[PDB]
Amino acid sequence: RYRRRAEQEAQAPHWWRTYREYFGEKTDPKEKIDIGLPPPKVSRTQQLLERKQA
Amino acid sequence: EDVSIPEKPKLRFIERAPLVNLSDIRGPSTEATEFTEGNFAILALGGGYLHWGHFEMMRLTINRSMDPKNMFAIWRVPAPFKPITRIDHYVTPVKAGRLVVEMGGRCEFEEVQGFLDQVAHKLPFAAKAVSRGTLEKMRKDQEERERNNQNPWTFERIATANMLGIRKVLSPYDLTHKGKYWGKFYMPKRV
Amino acid sequence: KFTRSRIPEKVFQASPEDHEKYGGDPQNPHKLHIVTRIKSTRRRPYWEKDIIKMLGLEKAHTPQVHKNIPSVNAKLKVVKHLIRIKPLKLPQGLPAEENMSNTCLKSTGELVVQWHLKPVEQ
Amino acid sequence: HRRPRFVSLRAKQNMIRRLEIEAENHYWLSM
Amino acid sequence: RHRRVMHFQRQKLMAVTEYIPPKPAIHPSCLP
Amino acid sequence: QLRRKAERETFARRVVLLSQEMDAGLQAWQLRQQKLQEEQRKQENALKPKGASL
RNA sequence: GUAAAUUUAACUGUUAGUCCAAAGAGGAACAGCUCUUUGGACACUAGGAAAAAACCUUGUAGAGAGAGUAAAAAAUUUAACA
């Protein structure tokens, strides 16, 4: 339980100096452009219904 | 009549030795600066150690002069704890601006001042009997002098900016004291 | 223990009253300092002695010109009690190549590019 | 056995003169 | 225990920084 | 008088040197800031978004 | 802002600390006393503080029957009507 909380805290950003700053890769903050095909359309209600019954 | 006297009005005895540091007597006091359940008190204007001998003197004088029903007295100074080696004797350091003794009850400052002032002159350091109104006037008067001071040059401004390299002839503690306190001695007139 | 003094930044924050008194302009800061030593470095800490030498102020009452930049000002603040700081004034602008030999720094703190040594008319 | 020494008026004026110069030094260093 | 002698530079500082009380142009008692 | 003329010209030349150095430094810093703004606009949209956006 | 720094080759001498300011630790919250630390002065000059190693001013390289300055002169006399 302590380790689960410890890992979560490490991921969070901190004002003090952290290992992620110096060693973590520096990448553009802006989200990566998506140039692919659009996602397929799925009806969640029907999908959830069939999966629960399965 | 509203005031109630505790079951033990007269001052309690002080132990000669604890049952079990020049800076202690230097600077403004950070504790026991405000009246607690007592209108009158003896205000310490200097810094000096208090051995048991003084405590017995103050307790004997205050108790006999005071009337048990009319007024009560509470000790503000702790028991002697500091060891002085010539342990030859134990003392209690008092910083400037501290209330050594407090007097509260059905009485007036003029009635109280008499014995309290008499005991004050015995203290090894400068002390003056004070009251709620008097002490507040003392602090209020001091603040008035600072705001209305016509001198464009002050110890704090010169010391903090290190003007004329004054900090070579000054102590580090003087930055906080601002020239009001010179060692154990405290100068009230200093602004 | 005597040590180096670090002045609070407040001391160096000019107020609206100071501007009227000294005639400065916070919107347009002066570019260059005129610095003269007016106090001895004798009986002063060695670090102050070193700062005086770095600034070129070993000789007293000798005007030196310095840039009004943070790094230079940090040095001046250490020895501020030993010097006089006055903004350099250019009423006629910077001296040109022709005017280099005709300049003069007056006590008011202005650098004049012409020095006739004649009386002004009427 | 140091005999006391006292501050003359001329000495106070001399010190005040230094304070005025340094006070101006603070202003010019501010900008 | 006794008031120690101060460095004369300090004594000069104290004197230059002494409180100067405000003086009214007209004495208050001399006014209605 | 000759010594004073030399000393004055040395003082004047230093005045010009310090002034120009400050001006040149000020201009160079301005250019760096303006370039940074242009650098931001350089990679605004290299490739048109095409996934889930119509 | 400045002009010194390290390294190499050689080599010599000095070093038994006094006072002032500051922070501690011992004496007695004595000593021109004991110990440590920070800074200053003193075996480099001169002016001032009464004489003046140690405080302040100032640094020191000559001549001048010129000039501007620095430090630089201690204050104080303490109520009353019936």
XYZ file of N, CA, C and O in Angstrom, chain B:
764
model
N -15.862 43.962 43.793
C -16.512 42.750 44.371
C -16.501 41.595 43.375
O -16.400 40.430 43.762
N -16.607 41.926 42.085
C -16.633 40.894 41.054
C -15.383 40.025 41.107
O -15.459 38.802 40.932
N -14.220 40.636 41.346
C -12.977 39.875 41.381
C -13.021 38.873 42.525
O -13.560 39.149 43.605
N -12.445 37.697 42.289
C -12.398 36.619 43.268
C -10.946 36.315 43.606
O -10.110 36.182 42.705
N -10.653 36.205 44.897
C -9.297 35.943 45.372
C -9.057 34.439 45.407
O -9.927 33.687 45.871
N -7.911 33.950 44.935
C -7.639 32.512 45.026
C -7.446 32.075 46.469
O -7.100 32.870 47.345
N -7.683 30.783 46.708
C -7.545 30.227 48.050
C -6.198 30.552 48.683
O -6.088 30.551 49.915
N -5.173 30.829 47.878
C -3.838 31.165 48.373
C -3.449 32.523 47.805
O -2.813 32.607 46.745
N -3.815 33.616 48.485
C -3.504 34.952 47.956
C -2.019 35.281 47.978
O -1.446 35.656 46.950
N -1.388 35.148 49.142
C 0.010 35.528 49.279
C 0.895 34.703 48.351
O 0.560 33.582 47.964
N 2.041 35.281 47.997
C 2.968 34.623 47.085
C 3.523 33.347 47.705
O 3.882 33.313 48.886
N 3.592 32.295 46.896
C 4.091 31.006 47.355
C 5.615 31.018 47.454
O 6.302 31.841 46.844
N 6.137 30.080 48.241
C 7.575 29.964 48.434
C 8.256 29.474 47.159
O 7.682 28.724 46.367
N 9.499 29.914 46.968
C 10.305 29.557 45.805
C 11.468 28.692 46.269
O 12.165 29.039 47.232
N 11.679 27.569 45.584
C 12.747 26.650 45.951
C 14.114 27.288 45.734
O 14.329 28.024 44.768
N 15.045 26.998 46.648
C 16.402 27.521 46.514
C 17.121 26.905 45.322
O 17.874 27.593 44.623
N 16.907 25.616 45.074
C 17.576 24.902 43.998
C 16.559 24.061 43.242
O 15.567 23.608 43.826
N 16.776 23.839 41.946
C 15.810 23.056 41.168
C 15.776 21.605 41.617
O 16.806 21.011 41.943
N 14.569 21.034 41.631
C 14.423 19.633 42.006
C 15.124 18.721 41.006
O 15.744 17.723 41.393
N 15.038 19.048 39.720
C 15.656 18.241 38.674
C 15.144 16.806 38.750
O 14.384 16.362 37.890
N 25.874 31.824 29.641
C 24.689 32.151 28.856
C 24.345 33.629 28.991
O 23.245 33.984 29.411
N 25.297 34.492 28.629
C 25.074 35.931 28.724
C 23.971 36.407 27.787
O 23.367 37.454 28.042
N 23.699 35.665 26.711
C 22.637 36.059 25.791
C 21.268 36.018 26.458
O 20.335 36.687 26.000
N 21.125 35.239 27.533
C 19.820 35.089 28.169
C 19.285 36.426 28.667
O 18.077 36.679 28.601
N 20.164 37.290 29.172
C 19.756 38.564 29.750
C 19.881 39.710 28.753
O 19.839 40.879 29.150
N 20.034 39.407 27.467
C 20.277 40.410 26.440
C 19.117 40.430 25.456
O 18.735 39.385 24.920
N 18.564 41.617 25.221
C 17.550 41.805 24.212
C 16.151 41.901 24.784
O 15.936 41.774 25.993
N 15.168 42.132 23.915
C 13.775 42.182 24.375
C 13.271 40.809 24.788
O 13.676 39.785 24.231
N 12.381 40.796 25.775
C 11.773 39.554 26.226
C 10.666 39.132 25.271
O 9.870 39.957 24.815
N 10.619 37.836 24.970
C 9.608 37.276 24.083
C 8.458 36.617 24.832
O 7.484 36.202 24.197
N 8.543 36.511 26.156
C 7.519 35.855 26.954
C 7.162 36.721 28.156
O 7.948 37.560 28.602
N 5.953 36.503 28.675
C 5.474 37.196 29.872
C 5.479 38.709 29.676
O 5.842 39.471 30.576
N 5.070 39.153 28.488
C 4.983 40.573 28.185
C 3.592 41.150 28.414
O 3.447 42.377 28.453
N 2.574 40.305 28.562
C 1.189 40.740 28.677
C 0.617 40.323 30.025
O 0.939 39.247 30.542
N -0.227 41.182 30.589
C -0.890 40.864 31.847
C -1.793 39.647 31.687
O -2.510 39.510 30.693
N -1.749 38.759 32.677
C -2.629 37.599 32.741
C -3.334 37.601 34.090
O -2.688 37.429 35.129
N -4.651 37.803 34.069
C -5.484 37.795 35.274
C -4.874 38.665 36.373
O -4.770 38.268 37.536
N -4.477 39.877 35.995
C -3.932 40.827 36.946
C -3.649 42.175 36.316
O -2.935 42.259 35.313
N -4.201 43.240 36.899
C -4.098 44.554 36.271
C -2.702 45.144 36.431
O -2.171 45.752 35.496
N -2.093 44.973 37.599
C -0.813 45.588 37.912
C 0.300 44.550 37.888
O 0.065 43.346 38.019
N 1.528 45.033 37.718
C 2.693 44.158 37.675
C 3.948 45.014 37.780
O 3.897 46.243 37.699
N 5.080 44.339 37.961
C 6.394 44.970 37.962
C 7.041 44.677 36.617
O 7.241 43.510 36.258
N 7.375 45.730 35.877
C 7.918 45.599 34.533
C 9.436 45.716 34.585
O 9.970 46.704 35.097
N 10.121 44.703 34.060
C 11.577 44.708 34.013
C 12.046 45.571 32.846
O 11.698 45.302 31.691
N 12.831 46.600 33.147
C 13.422 47.460 32.131
C 14.887 47.139 31.873
O 15.537 47.852 31.104
N 15.423 46.093 32.505
C 16.797 45.698 32.291
C 16.928 44.189 32.328
O 15.973 43.469 32.629
N 18.133 43.720 32.012
C 18.405 42.296 32.026
C 19.375 41.898 33.117
O 20.532 42.328 33.117
N 18.918 41.079 34.052
C 19.767 40.623 35.139
C 19.280 39.301 35.682
O 18.085 38.993 35.638
N 20.217 38.512 36.197
C 19.877 37.236 36.803
C 19.325 37.449 38.208
O 19.711 38.383 38.916
N 18.410 36.566 38.610
C 17.746 36.644 39.909
C 18.046 35.377 40.700
O 17.559 34.295 40.354
N 18.842 35.509 41.759
C 19.092 34.390 42.651
C 17.967 34.271 43.679
O 17.115 35.152 43.813
N 17.971 33.156 44.415
C 16.901 32.906 45.376
C 16.805 34.025 46.403
O 15.703 34.390 46.834
N 17.947 34.574 46.822
C 17.926 35.650 47.799
C 16.939 36.745 47.447
O 16.209 37.238 48.310
N 16.900 37.142 46.173
C 15.942 38.157 45.751
C 14.510 37.659 45.904
O 13.630 38.405 46.350
N 14.258 36.397 45.542
C 12.901 35.866 45.613
C 12.357 35.929 47.034
O 11.206 36.325 47.249
N 13.171 35.544 48.019
C 12.728 35.613 49.407
C 12.441 37.052 49.812
O 11.465 37.325 50.520
N 13.288 37.986 49.375
C 13.069 39.394 49.684
C 11.749 39.881 49.101
O 10.933 40.493 49.803
N 11.520 39.624 47.812
C 10.288 40.077 47.176
C 9.067 39.417 47.802
O 8.055 40.080 48.057
N 9.141 38.108 48.055
C 7.993 37.402 48.615
C 7.649 37.930 50.002
O 6.472 38.126 50.326
N 8.662 38.167 50.836
C 8.412 38.662 52.185
C 7.791 40.054 52.150
O 6.810 40.327 52.849
N 8.354 40.949 51.336
C 7.860 42.322 51.286
C 6.454 42.383 50.703
O 5.551 42.987 51.293
N 6.251 41.767 49.538
C 4.946 41.820 48.883
C 3.867 41.257 49.800
O 2.791 41.845 49.956
N 4.138 40.107 50.419
C 3.111 39.433 51.209
C 2.663 40.288 52.390
O 1.462 40.444 52.635
N 3.614 40.844 53.145
C 3.234 41.617 54.323
C 2.505 42.895 53.929
O 1.514 43.273 54.563
N 2.979 43.576 52.884
C 2.348 44.826 52.473
C 0.947 44.587 51.924
O 0.019 45.345 52.227
N 0.772 43.542 51.120
C -0.522 43.277 50.509
C -1.514 42.767 51.548
O -1.144 42.140 52.543
N -2.796 43.046 51.300
C -3.866 42.501 52.124
C -4.440 41.265 51.450
O -4.830 41.340 50.276
N -4.509 40.115 52.129
C -4.936 38.891 51.427
C -6.307 39.003 50.784
O -6.480 38.592 49.629
N -7.290 39.550 51.499
C -8.636 39.652 50.947
C -8.694 40.638 49.786
O -9.381 40.389 48.790
N -7.991 41.767 49.899
C -8.123 42.812 48.890
C -7.491 42.406 47.563
O -8.077 42.638 46.499
N -6.304 41.802 47.597
C -5.540 41.563 46.381
C -4.814 40.227 46.465
O -4.614 39.667 47.546
N -4.422 39.726 45.293
C -3.650 38.499 45.165
C -2.468 38.734 44.236
O -2.505 39.612 43.369
N -1.415 37.940 44.422
C -0.202 38.039 43.622
C 0.169 36.666 43.079
O 0.064 35.660 43.786
N 0.604 36.634 41.821
C 0.993 35.404 41.139
C 2.422 35.557 40.637
O 2.773 36.588 40.051
N 3.242 34.533 40.868
C 4.603 34.531 40.348
C 4.596 34.359 38.835
O 3.875 33.512 38.300
N 5.399 35.170 38.145
C 5.624 34.987 36.718
C 6.996 34.407 36.405
O 7.170 33.807 35.341
N 7.965 34.572 37.301
C 9.323 34.074 37.098
C 9.381 32.597 37.476
O 8.804 32.203 38.500
N 10.058 31.740 36.693
C 10.222 30.342 37.119
C 11.227 30.197 38.251
O 11.784 31.193 38.725
N 11.464 28.967 38.693
C 12.440 28.735 39.743
C 13.859 28.871 39.188
O 14.087 28.667 37.993
N 14.829 29.221 40.033
C 16.216 29.309 39.557
C 16.680 27.992 38.952
O 16.567 26.930 39.569
N 17.205 28.070 37.730
C 17.635 26.880 37.006
C 19.057 27.030 36.479
O 19.771 26.036 36.321
N 19.477 28.260 36.206
C 20.795 28.475 35.622
C 21.876 28.184 36.659
O 21.794 28.685 37.787
N 22.899 27.385 36.327
C 23.970 27.120 37.296
C 25.100 28.134 37.227
O 25.672 28.362 36.156
N 25.428 28.748 38.361
C 26.536 29.694 38.465
C 27.619 29.050 39.316
O 27.375 28.685 40.474
N 28.814 28.913 38.748
C 29.947 28.288 39.418
C 30.973 29.361 39.759
O 31.422 30.096 38.873
N 31.340 29.443 41.034
C 32.317 30.420 41.497
C 33.609 29.727 41.917
O 33.808 28.544 41.637
N 27.932 23.709 42.148
C 27.344 24.981 41.751
C 27.246 25.898 42.963
O 26.684 25.523 43.991
N 27.801 27.105 42.836
C 27.782 28.042 43.954
C 26.365 28.510 44.261
O 25.964 28.568 45.430
N 25.594 28.850 43.231
C 24.233 29.331 43.424
C 23.487 29.247 42.101
O 24.090 29.121 41.033
N 22.162 29.321 42.192
C 21.279 29.239 41.039
C 20.561 30.566 40.850
O 20.219 31.241 41.828
N 20.334 30.940 39.590
C 19.758 32.234 39.251
C 18.696 32.051 38.175
O 18.603 31.005 37.528
N 17.886 33.092 37.994
C 16.826 33.115 36.986
C 17.005 34.330 36.084
O 16.767 35.468 36.524
N 17.420 34.156 34.829
C 17.622 35.320 33.961
C 16.302 35.940 33.529
O 15.350 35.242 33.175
N 16.257 37.271 33.561
C 15.085 38.044 33.167
C 15.494 39.000 32.055
O 16.438 39.781 32.220
N 14.795 38.932 30.926
C 15.053 39.843 29.823
C 14.271 41.142 30.003
O 13.274 41.206 30.727
N 14.741 42.186 29.326
C 14.083 43.483 29.402
C 12.673 43.400 28.836
O 12.408 42.664 27.882
N 11.760 44.165 29.431
C 10.382 44.173 28.990
C 9.532 43.050 29.538
O 8.427 42.828 29.029
N 10.007 42.334 30.552
C 9.293 41.206 31.128
C 8.675 41.608 32.461
O 9.269 42.374 33.226
N 7.483 41.083 32.734
C 6.778 41.350 33.983
C 7.251 40.347 35.029
O 6.892 39.166 34.974
N 8.057 40.816 35.983
C 8.603 39.925 37.002
C 7.494 39.412 37.914
O 7.373 38.204 38.152
N 6.669 40.318 38.434
C 5.582 39.972 39.339
C 4.317 40.660 38.850
O 4.369 41.740 38.254
N 3.173 40.035 39.116
C 1.880 40.567 38.716
C 0.976 40.678 39.934
O 0.943 39.777 40.778
N 0.247 41.789 40.019
C -0.661 42.066 41.126
C -2.051 42.319 40.565
O -2.240 43.232 39.753
N -3.015 41.517 40.995
C -4.394 41.701 40.586
C -5.330 41.506 41.758
O -5.090 40.679 42.641
N -6.406 42.281 41.757
C -7.382 42.202 42.827
C -8.175 43.493 42.926
O -8.170 44.314 42.011
N -8.854 43.644 44.065
C -9.653 44.834 44.353
C -8.732 45.905 44.933
O -8.609 46.084 46.148
N -8.073 46.631 44.035
C -7.132 47.670 44.433
C -6.921 48.612 43.257
O -7.353 48.345 42.133
N -6.248 49.725 43.538
C -5.919 50.730 42.542
C -4.405 50.798 42.385
O -3.650 50.397 43.275
N -3.962 51.308 41.233
C -2.529 51.353 40.957
C -1.790 52.165 42.012
O -0.696 51.786 42.442
N -2.370 53.287 42.440
C -1.722 54.098 43.467
C -1.563 53.310 44.759
O -0.529 53.404 45.430
N -2.578 52.523 45.123
C -2.459 51.665 46.297
C -1.407 50.586 46.078
O -0.639 50.264 46.993
N -1.357 50.016 44.873
C -0.430 48.925 44.601
C 0.985 49.450 44.394
O 1.958 48.842 44.853
N 1.122 50.579 43.693
C 2.441 51.086 43.324
C 3.376 51.167 44.523
O 4.584 50.934 44.394
N 2.842 51.505 45.698
C 3.705 51.784 46.836
C 4.643 50.638 47.163
O 5.866 50.799 47.156
N 4.086 49.461 47.452
C 4.934 48.324 47.805
C 5.631 47.752 46.576
O 6.801 47.359 46.648
N 4.931 47.691 45.440
C 5.538 47.134 44.234
C 6.748 47.952 43.805
O 7.796 47.394 43.462
N 6.624 49.281 43.820
C 7.756 50.130 43.469
C 8.895 49.953 44.464
O 10.071 49.942 44.079
N 8.567 49.812 45.751
C 9.599 49.614 46.761
C 10.385 48.339 46.496
O 11.619 48.329 46.581
N 9.686 47.248 46.178
C 10.364 45.999 45.845
C 11.156 46.152 44.552
O 12.239 45.576 44.398
N 10.628 46.928 43.604
C 11.288 47.062 42.309
C 12.697 47.618 42.460
O 13.630 47.153 41.793
N 12.876 48.613 43.330
C 14.192 49.221 43.492
C 15.220 48.235 44.029
O 16.423 48.444 43.836
N 14.778 47.167 44.694
C 15.707 46.165 45.204
C 16.212 45.250 44.095
O 17.357 44.786 44.144
N 15.369 44.964 43.106
C 15.763 44.097 42.005
C 17.135 44.505 41.470
O 17.437 45.702 41.389
N 17.988 43.546 41.096
C 19.326 43.901 40.592
C 19.303 44.674 39.288
O 20.356 45.173 38.869
N 18.151 44.785 38.634
C 18.029 45.478 37.362
C 16.890 46.482 37.447
O 15.993 46.369 38.287
N 16.940 47.475 36.565
C 15.931 48.524 36.572
C 14.548 47.928 36.349
O 14.334 47.153 35.412
N 13.610 48.290 37.220
C 12.238 47.820 37.118
C 11.312 48.898 37.658
O 11.667 49.634 38.583
N 10.122 48.984 37.070
C 9.123 49.970 37.458
C 7.758 49.305 37.520
O 7.391 48.551 36.613
N 7.011 49.581 38.587
C 5.661 49.049 38.699
C 4.783 49.636 37.601
O 4.843 50.833 37.310
N 3.962 48.783 36.987
C 3.127 49.181 35.862
C 1.719 48.633 36.040
O 1.480 47.687 36.793
N 0.785 49.249 35.322
C -0.610 48.843 35.297
C -1.058 48.731 33.847
O -0.376 49.196 32.930
N -2.215 48.099 33.646
C -2.748 47.944 32.295
C -2.780 49.278 31.562
O -2.242 49.407 30.457
N -3.400 50.289 32.169
C -3.452 51.594 31.531
C -2.076 52.210 31.361
O -1.743 52.738 30.297
N -1.258 52.153 32.413
C 0.076 52.741 32.350
C 0.932 52.053 31.293
O 1.550 52.715 30.452
N 0.983 50.719 31.322
C 1.824 49.997 30.372
C 1.378 50.250 28.938
O 2.213 50.448 28.048
N 0.065 50.249 28.692
C -0.422 50.541 27.348
C -0.061 51.962 26.936
O 0.338 52.202 25.791
N -0.187 52.919 27.858
C 0.248 54.277 27.559
C 1.744 54.307 27.278
O 2.207 55.042 26.398
N 2.516 53.509 28.020
C 3.953 53.442 27.788
C 4.256 52.948 26.379
O 5.097 53.523 25.677
N 3.579 51.882 25.946
C 3.794 51.368 24.599
C 3.203 52.306 23.554
O 3.821 52.553 22.512
N 2.006 52.839 23.813
C 1.401 53.778 22.875
C 2.247 55.037 22.745
O 2.422 55.566 21.641
N 2.779 55.534 23.864
C 3.628 56.719 23.812
C 4.890 56.451 23.003
O 5.335 57.310 22.231
N 5.481 55.265 23.165
C 6.686 54.935 22.413
C 6.407 54.921 20.916
O 7.209 55.428 20.123
N 5.274 54.346 20.511
C 4.927 54.319 19.094
C 4.721 55.729 18.555
O 5.068 56.018 17.404
N 4.151 56.619 19.371
C 3.938 57.993 18.931
C 5.265 58.688 18.656
O 5.389 59.446 17.687
N 6.267 58.448 19.504
C 7.565 59.081 19.310
C 8.192 58.658 17.987
O 8.809 59.475 17.293
N 8.047 57.382 17.623
C 8.638 56.900 16.379
C 7.974 57.535 15.162
O 8.661 57.975 14.232
N 6.641 57.590 15.148
C 5.941 58.115 13.979
C 6.173 59.612 13.812
O 6.323 60.098 12.685
N 6.208 60.359 14.912
C 6.360 61.807 14.853
C 7.811 62.261 14.940
O 8.063 63.470 14.985
N 8.764 61.333 14.969
C 10.168 61.709 15.040
C 10.550 62.557 13.833
O 10.269 62.191 12.688
N 11.192 63.692 14.096
C 11.608 64.597 13.034
C 12.979 64.261 12.469
O 13.297 64.691 11.355
N 13.791 63.512 13.203
C 15.115 63.144 12.726
C 14.991 62.253 11.496
O 14.387 61.174 11.583
N 15.538 62.649 10.340
C 15.455 61.782 9.157
C 16.380 60.577 9.209
O 16.310 59.729 8.310
N 17.235 60.477 10.223
C 18.192 59.386 10.351
C 17.866 58.583 11.599
O 17.719 59.148 12.686
N 17.753 57.266 11.437
C 17.413 56.370 12.531
C 18.424 55.236 12.590
O 19.059 54.895 11.588
N 18.569 54.657 13.783
C 19.524 53.569 13.963
C 19.191 52.395 13.052
O 20.086 51.796 12.445
N 17.905 52.054 12.941
C 17.514 50.903 12.136
C 17.863 51.112 10.668
O 18.408 50.213 10.018
N 17.557 52.292 10.127
C 17.844 52.554 8.721
C 19.342 52.485 8.453
O 19.784 51.875 7.472
N 20.140 53.109 9.319
C 21.587 53.115 9.128
C 22.156 51.712 9.294
O 23.023 51.284 8.525
N 21.681 50.975 10.301
C 22.229 49.651 10.568
C 21.837 48.653 9.486
O 22.664 47.839 9.057
N 20.584 48.695 9.029
C 20.124 47.706 8.057
C 20.788 47.914 6.703
O 21.154 46.942 6.031
N 20.955 49.167 6.285
C 21.606 49.463 5.017
C 23.125 49.452 5.122
O 23.802 49.569 4.095
N 23.672 49.315 6.330
C 25.118 49.320 6.540
C 25.732 50.627 6.047
O 26.815 50.648 5.461
N 25.028 51.732 6.280
C 25.524 53.031 5.852
C 26.770 53.400 6.645
O 26.844 53.178 7.857
N 27.758 53.962 5.949
C 29.055 54.299 6.531
C 29.793 53.065 7.035
O 30.726 53.179 7.834
N 29.397 51.877 6.579
C 29.997 50.657 7.087
C 29.825 50.500 8.579
O 30.685 49.911 9.242
N 28.725 51.016 9.122
C 28.481 51.042 10.560
C 28.514 49.642 11.158
O 28.795 49.476 12.349
N 28.235 48.621 10.347
C 28.157 47.271 10.893
C 29.507 46.757 11.368
O 29.553 45.726 12.046
N 30.600 47.445 11.034
C 31.903 47.055 11.557
C 32.003 47.323 13.052
O 32.675 46.577 13.771
N 31.344 48.378 13.537
C 31.374 48.739 14.949
C 30.109 48.300 15.681
O 29.913 48.668 16.842
N 29.248 47.520 15.033
C 27.976 47.108 15.606
C 27.915 45.590 15.717
O 28.617 44.864 15.010
N 27.060 45.124 16.620
C 26.835 43.702 16.793
C 25.810 43.199 15.783
O 24.990 43.969 15.281
N 25.834 41.902 15.462
C 24.762 41.359 14.613
C 23.388 41.507 15.240
O 22.404 41.742 14.530
N 23.298 41.369 16.565
C 22.016 41.498 17.247
C 21.452 42.909 17.160
O 20.246 43.094 17.356
N 22.290 43.907 16.871
C 21.807 45.283 16.826
C 20.812 45.495 15.694
O 19.981 46.407 15.766
N 20.882 44.678 14.642
C 19.917 44.802 13.555
C 18.497 44.583 14.059
O 17.570 45.296 13.660
N 18.304 43.595 14.935
C 16.992 43.376 15.533
C 16.712 44.375 16.649
O 15.600 44.903 16.746
N 17.704 44.642 17.500
C 17.490 45.555 18.620
C 17.223 46.974 18.135
O 16.403 47.690 18.720
N 17.913 47.401 17.077
C 17.724 48.713 16.462
C 18.238 49.850 17.337
O 17.788 50.991 17.198
N 19.177 49.564 18.238
C 19.778 50.579 19.074
C 19.060 50.843 20.378
O 19.581 51.595 21.211
N 17.880 50.255 20.585
C 17.187 50.421 21.857
C 17.872 49.650 22.977
O 17.794 50.055 24.141
N 18.539 48.545 22.652
C 19.137 47.657 23.642
C 20.647 47.645 23.459
O 21.141 47.348 22.366
N 21.372 47.968 24.527
C 22.833 47.935 24.552
C 23.249 46.921 25.611
O 23.286 47.238 26.805
N 23.560 45.705 25.175
C 23.866 44.650 26.125
C 22.651 44.343 26.976
O 21.525 44.237 26.476
N 22.870 44.193 28.283
C 21.750 43.967 29.188
C 20.915 45.233 29.353
O 19.691 45.162 29.508
N 21.560 46.396 29.326
C 20.856 47.655 29.529
C 19.926 47.953 28.360
O 20.268 47.723 27.196
N 18.743 48.469 28.680
C 17.745 48.859 27.692
C 17.486 50.352 27.813
O 17.230 50.856 28.912
N 17.547 51.056 26.682
C 17.380 52.502 26.663
C 15.981 52.843 26.175
O 15.713 52.729 24.969
N 15.060 53.263 27.050
C 13.694 53.535 26.573
C 13.606 54.733 25.646
O 12.854 54.693 24.664
N 14.353 55.803 25.926
C 14.253 57.007 25.110
C 14.660 56.760 23.665
O 14.226 57.500 22.775
N 15.483 55.747 23.410
C 15.940 55.478 22.053
C 14.770 55.097 21.156
O 13.941 54.256 21.513
N 14.711 55.722 19.985
C 13.647 55.470 19.025
C 14.137 54.500 17.955
O 13.353 53.771 17.349
